[PDB]
Protein backbone atom coordinates (compact mmCIF):
# COMPACT_ATOMS: atom_id res chain seq x y z
CA UNK A 1 0.00 0.00 0.00
CA UNK A 2 1.11 3.55 -0.82
CA UNK A 3 -0.76 6.48 0.71
CA UNK A 4 -1.50 9.87 -0.81
CA UNK A 5 1.02 11.52 1.52
CA UNK A 6 3.75 9.07 0.50
CA UNK A 7 3.20 9.75 -3.21
CA UNK A 8 3.37 13.48 -2.47
CA UNK A 9 6.80 13.01 -0.89
CA UNK A 10 8.00 11.05 -3.92
CA UNK A 11 6.91 13.91 -6.18
CA UNK A 12 9.24 16.24 -4.27
CA UNK A 13 12.28 13.96 -4.52
CA UNK A 14 11.92 13.64 -8.30
CA UNK A 15 11.70 17.41 -8.72
CA UNK A 16 14.87 17.95 -6.68
CA UNK A 17 16.70 15.03 -8.27
CA UNK A 18 15.63 16.34 -11.66
CA UNK A 19 17.49 19.57 -10.88
CA UNK A 20 20.61 17.74 -9.68
CA UNK A 21 20.75 15.56 -12.79
CA UNK A 22 20.80 18.69 -14.95
CA UNK A 23 23.57 20.20 -12.83
CA UNK A 24 25.67 17.07 -13.40
CA UNK A 25 25.24 17.05 -17.18
CA UNK A 26 25.43 20.83 -17.61
CA UNK A 27 21.89 21.31 -18.91
CA UNK A 28 19.17 23.84 -18.14
CA UNK A 29 16.97 22.53 -15.29
CA UNK A 30 14.01 24.40 -16.78
CA UNK A 31 14.15 22.90 -20.29
CA UNK A 32 15.08 19.41 -19.06
CA UNK A 33 12.47 16.99 -20.39
CA UNK A 34 11.99 13.33 -19.54
CA UNK A 35 13.76 12.33 -22.76
CA UNK A 36 16.96 13.95 -21.47
CA UNK A 37 16.67 12.15 -18.13
CA UNK A 38 16.50 8.75 -19.81
CA UNK A 39 19.56 9.57 -21.92
CA UNK A 40 21.55 10.82 -18.92
CA UNK A 41 20.64 7.84 -16.73
CA UNK A 42 21.86 5.50 -19.47
CA UNK A 43 25.29 7.14 -19.56
CA UNK A 44 25.83 7.26 -15.80
CA UNK A 45 24.32 3.82 -15.07
CA UNK A 46 25.08 1.70 -18.15
CA UNK A 47 23.14 -1.57 -18.11
CA UNK A 48 22.99 -3.94 -21.07
CA UNK A 49 20.39 -6.24 -19.58
CA UNK A 50 18.08 -7.52 -22.29
CA UNK A 51 14.97 -6.71 -20.24
CA UNK A 52 14.37 -2.96 -20.33
CA UNK A 53 12.16 -3.18 -17.23
CA UNK A 54 15.20 -4.31 -15.19
CA UNK A 55 17.48 -1.38 -16.07
CA UNK A 56 18.00 1.73 -13.93
CA UNK A 57 15.01 4.04 -14.23
CA UNK A 58 14.23 7.52 -12.86
CA UNK A 59 10.65 8.37 -13.85
CA UNK A 60 7.73 10.31 -12.42
CA UNK A 61 5.95 8.56 -9.50
CA UNK A 62 2.69 8.78 -11.44
CA UNK A 63 4.17 6.38 -14.02
CA UNK A 64 5.99 3.99 -11.64
CA UNK A 65 3.50 3.35 -8.85
CA UNK A 66 0.23 1.70 -9.94
CA UNK A 67 -2.95 3.73 -9.76
CA UNK A 68 -4.91 3.06 -6.58
CA UNK A 69 -8.54 3.70 -5.75
CA UNK A 70 -9.43 6.53 -3.40
CA UNK A 71 -11.01 5.89 -0.01
CA UNK A 72 -14.68 5.06 -0.45
CA UNK A 73 -16.07 6.02 2.98
CA UNK A 74 -15.52 8.93 5.34
CA UNK A 75 -15.03 9.21 9.08
CA UNK A 76 -18.67 8.47 9.90
CA UNK A 77 -18.44 5.29 7.81
CA UNK A 78 -21.00 5.97 5.10
CA UNK A 79 -19.67 5.18 1.61
CA UNK A 80 -19.58 7.96 -0.97
CA UNK A 81 -21.32 5.97 -3.73
CA UNK A 82 -24.79 4.42 -3.71
CA UNK A 83 -23.56 1.30 -5.57
CA UNK A 84 -20.74 0.65 -3.09
CA UNK A 85 -22.00 -2.64 -1.65
CA UNK A 86 -21.95 -4.21 -5.11
CA UNK A 87 -18.15 -4.24 -5.01
CA UNK A 88 -18.02 -2.78 -8.53
CA UNK A 89 -19.46 0.69 -8.01
CA UNK A 90 -17.53 2.01 -11.02
CA UNK A 91 -18.53 -0.77 -13.43
CA UNK A 92 -22.19 -0.69 -12.40
CA UNK A 93 -22.43 3.10 -12.31
CA UNK A 94 -21.37 2.94 -15.96
CA UNK A 95 -23.90 0.25 -16.86
CA UNK A 96 -26.59 2.25 -15.06
CA UNK A 97 -25.77 5.40 -17.02
CA UNK A 98 -25.78 3.61 -20.38
CA UNK A 99 -29.04 1.78 -19.71
CA UNK A 100 -30.57 5.11 -18.69
CA UNK A 101 -29.69 6.66 -22.05
CA UNK A 102 -31.31 3.76 -23.91
CA UNK A 103 -34.61 4.49 -22.16
CA UNK A 104 -34.58 8.14 -23.24
CA UNK A 105 -34.19 7.32 -26.94
CA UNK A 106 -37.28 5.11 -26.85
CA UNK A 107 -39.31 7.83 -25.13
CA UNK A 108 -38.91 10.89 -27.36
CA UNK A 109 -38.96 8.68 -30.48
CA UNK A 110 -14.80 2.28 -37.72
CA UNK A 111 -11.77 1.20 -39.75
CA UNK A 112 -9.38 2.97 -37.39
CA UNK A 113 -11.62 2.77 -34.34
CA UNK A 114 -11.50 -0.37 -32.20
CA UNK A 115 -13.46 -1.29 -29.08
CA UNK A 116 -11.56 -0.76 -25.84
CA UNK A 117 -9.80 -3.93 -24.74
CA UNK A 118 -10.42 -5.51 -21.35
CA UNK A 119 -7.06 -4.59 -19.81
CA UNK A 120 -7.52 -0.98 -20.91
CA UNK A 121 -10.98 -0.73 -19.34
CA UNK A 122 -9.80 -1.68 -15.84
CA UNK A 123 -7.46 1.32 -15.82
CA UNK A 124 -10.32 3.67 -16.67
CA UNK A 125 -12.57 2.15 -14.00
CA UNK A 126 -9.75 1.26 -11.58
CA UNK A 127 -11.65 -2.00 -11.05
CA UNK A 128 -10.89 -5.68 -11.54
CA UNK A 129 -13.10 -7.23 -14.22
CA UNK A 130 -13.97 -10.65 -15.58
CA UNK A 131 -14.24 -11.57 -19.25
CA UNK A 132 -18.01 -12.08 -19.33
CA UNK A 133 -18.45 -8.69 -17.66
CA UNK A 134 -16.46 -7.05 -20.45
CA UNK A 135 -18.71 -8.62 -23.09
CA UNK A 136 -21.93 -7.40 -21.46
CA UNK A 137 -20.68 -3.81 -21.44
CA UNK A 138 -19.60 -4.05 -25.08
CA UNK A 139 -23.06 -5.31 -26.04
CA UNK A 140 -24.78 -2.19 -24.69
CA UNK A 141 -22.36 0.14 -26.48
CA UNK A 142 -22.98 -1.53 -29.85
CA UNK A 143 -26.72 -1.45 -29.17
CA UNK A 144 -26.34 2.27 -28.46
CA UNK A 145 -24.80 2.93 -31.88
CA UNK A 146 -27.55 1.22 -33.88
CA UNK A 147 -30.12 3.59 -32.40
CA UNK A 148 -30.24 7.22 -33.53
CA UNK A 149 -27.88 8.42 -30.82
CA UNK A 150 -27.61 12.14 -30.14
CA UNK A 151 -24.50 14.27 -30.30
CA UNK A 152 -23.89 14.01 -26.55
CA UNK A 153 -24.13 10.22 -26.77
CA UNK A 154 -21.45 9.94 -29.46
CA UNK A 155 -18.95 11.80 -27.28
CA UNK A 156 -19.59 9.28 -24.50
CA UNK A 157 -19.09 6.26 -26.77
CA UNK A 158 -15.85 7.75 -28.10
CA UNK A 159 -14.33 7.52 -24.61
CA UNK A 160 -14.32 3.72 -25.03
CA UNK A 161 -12.96 3.58 -28.60
CA UNK A 162 -9.28 3.57 -29.56
CA UNK A 163 -7.81 4.54 -32.92
CA UNK A 164 -5.80 2.02 -34.93
CA UNK A 165 -2.79 2.69 -37.16
CA UNK A 166 -3.51 0.77 -40.36
CA UNK A 167 -0.29 -0.25 -42.08
CA UNK A 168 0.03 -0.09 -45.86
CA UNK A 169 1.25 -3.14 -47.77
CA UNK A 170 2.57 -1.02 -50.63
CA UNK A 171 6.14 -1.53 -51.82
CA UNK A 172 8.50 1.43 -51.48
CA UNK A 173 9.83 2.64 -54.83
CA UNK A 174 13.55 3.37 -55.09
CA UNK A 175 14.78 6.79 -56.31
CA UNK A 176 15.85 6.61 -59.95
CA UNK A 177 19.45 7.79 -60.28
CA UNK A 178 21.59 9.02 -63.16
CA UNK A 179 25.16 8.06 -64.01
CA UNK A 180 27.91 10.15 -65.60
CA UNK A 181 26.81 9.14 -69.11
CA UNK A 182 23.22 10.09 -68.25
CA UNK A 183 21.60 6.65 -68.12
CA UNK A 184 18.76 6.14 -65.64
CA UNK A 185 18.93 3.23 -63.21
CA UNK A 186 17.77 2.06 -59.79
CA UNK A 187 19.61 0.09 -57.11
CA UNK A 188 18.17 -2.31 -54.54
CA UNK A 189 19.25 -5.19 -52.31
CA UNK A 190 18.11 -8.76 -51.81
CA UNK A 191 18.83 -11.45 -49.24
CA UNK A 192 18.30 -15.21 -49.44
CA UNK A 193 19.66 -17.47 -46.69
CA UNK A 194 23.28 -16.25 -46.26
CA UNK A 195 23.46 -14.79 -49.78
CA UNK A 196 23.32 -11.01 -50.16
CA UNK A 197 23.03 -9.28 -53.52
CA UNK A 198 23.15 -5.70 -54.81
CA UNK A 199 21.50 -5.17 -58.20
CA UNK A 200 21.71 -2.19 -60.56
CA UNK A 201 18.96 -2.08 -63.19
CA UNK A 202 19.25 0.36 -66.07
CA UNK A 203 16.07 1.84 -67.50
CA UNK A 204 17.01 0.99 -71.11
CA UNK A 205 18.95 -2.07 -72.20
CA UNK A 206 19.14 -5.09 -74.49
CA UNK A 207 18.51 -7.75 -71.85
CA UNK A 208 22.10 -8.18 -70.64
CA UNK A 209 22.84 -9.41 -67.11
CA UNK A 210 26.29 -9.55 -65.50
CA UNK A 211 26.87 -11.12 -62.08
CA UNK A 212 30.19 -10.22 -60.45
CA UNK A 213 31.48 -9.23 -63.89
CA UNK A 214 30.40 -12.46 -65.61
CA UNK A 215 27.53 -12.94 -68.03
CA UNK A 216 24.60 -14.66 -66.38
CA UNK A 217 24.51 -17.80 -68.52
CA UNK A 218 28.14 -18.53 -67.58
CA UNK A 219 27.69 -17.74 -63.88
CA UNK A 220 24.50 -19.85 -63.59
CA UNK A 221 25.00 -23.06 -65.60
CA UNK A 222 21.91 -24.66 -64.08
CA UNK A 223 18.70 -23.88 -65.95
CA UNK A 224 16.62 -23.55 -62.77
CA UNK A 225 18.78 -20.64 -61.61
CA UNK A 226 18.33 -18.79 -64.91
CA UNK A 227 14.57 -19.36 -64.71
CA UNK A 228 14.53 -17.38 -61.46
CA UNK A 229 16.28 -14.43 -63.10
CA UNK A 230 13.69 -14.50 -65.90
CA UNK A 231 10.66 -14.59 -63.60
CA UNK A 232 10.66 -10.88 -62.60
CA UNK A 233 10.89 -9.60 -66.18
CA UNK A 234 8.57 -12.17 -67.76
CA UNK A 235 5.79 -11.40 -65.28
CA UNK A 236 5.72 -7.75 -66.42
CA UNK A 237 6.49 -8.45 -70.10
CA UNK A 238 9.86 -6.69 -70.14
CA UNK A 239 12.25 -9.34 -71.47
CA UNK A 240 15.00 -7.73 -73.53
CA UNK A 241 14.49 -4.13 -72.46
CA UNK A 242 16.81 -3.56 -69.47
CA UNK A 243 20.45 -4.14 -68.56
CA UNK A 244 21.31 -5.47 -65.11
CA UNK A 245 24.64 -5.35 -63.25
CA UNK A 246 24.59 -7.08 -59.86
CA UNK A 247 27.04 -8.41 -57.29
CA UNK A 248 26.12 -11.40 -55.12
CA UNK A 249 28.20 -12.72 -52.24
CA UNK A 250 27.90 -15.72 -49.95
CA UNK A 251 25.44 -18.55 -49.89
CA UNK A 252 25.24 -21.31 -52.44
CA UNK A 253 24.22 -21.92 -56.04
CA UNK A 254 20.45 -21.58 -55.66
CA UNK A 255 20.50 -19.05 -52.82
CA UNK A 256 22.34 -16.49 -54.95
CA UNK A 257 19.65 -16.58 -57.64
CA UNK A 258 16.78 -16.01 -55.22
CA UNK A 259 18.79 -13.18 -53.69
CA UNK A 260 19.35 -11.66 -57.13
CA UNK A 261 15.74 -12.24 -58.21
CA UNK A 262 14.58 -10.19 -55.22
CA UNK A 263 16.93 -7.27 -55.84
CA UNK A 264 16.17 -7.06 -59.57
CA UNK A 265 12.45 -7.06 -58.78
CA UNK A 266 12.77 -4.33 -56.15
CA UNK A 267 14.83 -2.15 -58.50
CA UNK A 268 12.47 -2.94 -61.39
CA UNK A 269 9.60 -1.39 -59.40
CA UNK A 270 10.79 2.12 -60.31
CA UNK A 271 10.27 1.61 -64.07
CA UNK A 272 6.74 0.16 -63.86
CA UNK A 273 3.24 1.25 -62.90
CA UNK A 274 1.76 0.98 -59.42
CA UNK A 275 -0.71 -1.70 -60.52
CA UNK A 276 2.17 -3.86 -61.74
CA UNK A 277 4.10 -3.37 -58.49
CA UNK A 278 1.03 -4.61 -56.62
CA UNK A 279 0.84 -7.65 -58.90
CA UNK A 280 4.53 -8.40 -58.29
CA UNK A 281 3.73 -8.29 -54.57
CA UNK A 282 0.78 -10.69 -54.87
CA UNK A 283 3.03 -13.10 -56.79
CA UNK A 284 5.77 -13.26 -54.15
CA UNK A 285 8.46 -11.28 -55.97
CA UNK A 286 8.94 -8.48 -53.41
CA UNK A 287 8.95 -10.58 -50.22
CA UNK A 288 12.12 -11.63 -48.43
CA UNK A 289 12.01 -15.37 -47.80
CA UNK A 290 12.41 -15.92 -44.03
CA UNK A 291 13.02 -19.68 -44.32
CA UNK A 292 16.56 -20.17 -42.98
CA UNK A 293 18.40 -23.18 -41.62
CA UNK A 294 17.25 -24.25 -38.17
CA UNK A 295 19.69 -25.10 -35.41
CA UNK A 296 20.55 -28.55 -34.12
CA UNK A 297 19.60 -29.39 -30.55
CA UNK A 298 21.47 -31.43 -27.93
CA UNK A 299 19.97 -34.86 -27.45
CA UNK A 300 18.89 -34.88 -31.10
CA UNK A 301 20.51 -35.88 -34.37
CA UNK A 302 19.19 -32.78 -36.14
CA UNK A 303 16.98 -29.72 -35.83
CA UNK A 304 13.81 -31.82 -35.61
CA UNK A 305 14.93 -35.45 -35.88
CA UNK A 306 15.34 -37.55 -32.75
CA UNK A 307 17.63 -40.39 -31.77
CA UNK A 308 16.31 -43.90 -32.28
CA UNK A 309 13.90 -44.69 -29.45
CA UNK A 310 14.04 -48.07 -27.70
CA UNK A 311 11.03 -49.07 -25.62
CA UNK A 312 12.90 -52.03 -24.10
Partner 1 sequence: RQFSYLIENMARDCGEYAHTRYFRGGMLTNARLLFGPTVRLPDLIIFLHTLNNIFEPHVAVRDAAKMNIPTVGIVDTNCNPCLITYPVPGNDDSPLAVHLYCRLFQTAITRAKEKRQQVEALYRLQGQK
Partner 2 sequence: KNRAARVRVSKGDKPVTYEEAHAPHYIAHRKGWLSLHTGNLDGEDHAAERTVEDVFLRKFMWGTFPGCLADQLVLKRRGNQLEICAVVLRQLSPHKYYFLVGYSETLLSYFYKCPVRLHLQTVPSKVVYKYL
Partner 3 sequence: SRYSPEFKDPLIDKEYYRKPVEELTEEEKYVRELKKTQLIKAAPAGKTSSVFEDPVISKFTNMMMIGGNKVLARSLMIQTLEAVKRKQFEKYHAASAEEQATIERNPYTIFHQALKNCEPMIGLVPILKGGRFYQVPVPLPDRRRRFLAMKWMITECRDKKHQRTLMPEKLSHKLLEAFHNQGPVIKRKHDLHKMAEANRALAHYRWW
Partner RNA sequence: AAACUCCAGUUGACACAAAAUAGACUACGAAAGUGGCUUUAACAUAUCUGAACACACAAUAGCUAAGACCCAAACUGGGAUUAGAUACCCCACUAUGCUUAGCCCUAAACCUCAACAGUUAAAUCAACAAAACUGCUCGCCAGAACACUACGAGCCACAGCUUAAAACUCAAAGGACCUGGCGGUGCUUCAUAUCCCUCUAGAGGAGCCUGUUCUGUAAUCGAUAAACCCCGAUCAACCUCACCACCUCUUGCUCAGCCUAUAUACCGCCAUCUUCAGCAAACCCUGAUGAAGGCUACAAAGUAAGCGCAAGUACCCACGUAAAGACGUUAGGUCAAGGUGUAGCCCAUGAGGUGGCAAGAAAUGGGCUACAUUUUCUACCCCAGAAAACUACGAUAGCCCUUAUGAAACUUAAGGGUCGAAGGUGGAUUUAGC
Partner RNA sequence: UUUAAGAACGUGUUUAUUU
Give the span between the Cα atoms of 274 and 272, in whole angstroms.
7
Q: Which residues contact 21 (CB under 8 A, 6 or more apart)?
A: 32, 37, 40, 41, 58
For residue 76, report the phi and psi dihedrals to the nearest 5 degrees.
Answer: -60, -35
- Rounded to a whole number of angstroms, the minimum distance from the CB of residue 2 to partner 2 is 17
Helix or strand (DSSP H, E) at 184: strand 184-192
Site for RNA in 262-301 (CB under 7 A): 290, 292, 294-295, 297-298
Q: Is 177 in the site for partner 2 (CB under 8 A)?
A: no
Smaller CB distance to partner 2: residue 54 or 70? 54
Counting contacts by CB under 8 A, is residue 27 touching partner 3?
no
Q: Name which position in 302, 303, 304, 310 contacts Mg ion (CB under 5 A).
A: 302
> Does 140 interact with partner 1 (rule: CB under 8 A)?
no
Question: Does 132 contact RNA by CB under 7 A?
Answer: yes
Pick from 50, 66, 148, 213 the residue near RNA by CB under 7 A: 50
Does 168 interact with RNA (rule: CB under 7 A)?
Answer: no
Q: Which residues pair with 208 in a beta bridge?
A: 243
In the bound complex, what is the minimum distance in angstroms from residue 189's beta carbon to RNA? Answer: 15
Task: List CB contacts of 278: < 8 A, sequence separation 6 or more.
Answer: 170, 171
- With 0-12 CB in 10 A as exposed, 13-18 as middle and 19+ as buried, what is 82? exposed
Among residues 193, 235, 243, 272, which is the contact residue for partner 3, using CB under 8 A? 235
* Cα separation values, 205 from 185, 202, 212, Å: 10, 7, 18
Q: How far is the CB of 114 from partner 3 (least distance, A)?
A: 16
Tell me which residues in 286-305 interact with partner 3 (CB under 8 A). Answer: 287-292
Least Å from the CB of residue 259 to partner 3: 11
Q: By CB under 5 A, is residue 300 in contact with Mg ion?
A: no
H or E stretch at 195: strand 195-202
Binding site for Mg ion (CB under 5 A): 302
Amino acid sequence: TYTEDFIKKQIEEFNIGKRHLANMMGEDPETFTQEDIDRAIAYLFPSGLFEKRARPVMKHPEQIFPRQRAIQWGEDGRPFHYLFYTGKQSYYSLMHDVYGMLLNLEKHQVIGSRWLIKEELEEMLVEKLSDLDYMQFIRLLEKLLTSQCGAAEEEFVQRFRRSVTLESKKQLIEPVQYDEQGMAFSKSEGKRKTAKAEAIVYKHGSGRIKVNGIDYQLYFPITQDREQLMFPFHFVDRLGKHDVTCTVSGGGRSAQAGAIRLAMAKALCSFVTEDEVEWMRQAGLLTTDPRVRERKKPGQEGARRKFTWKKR
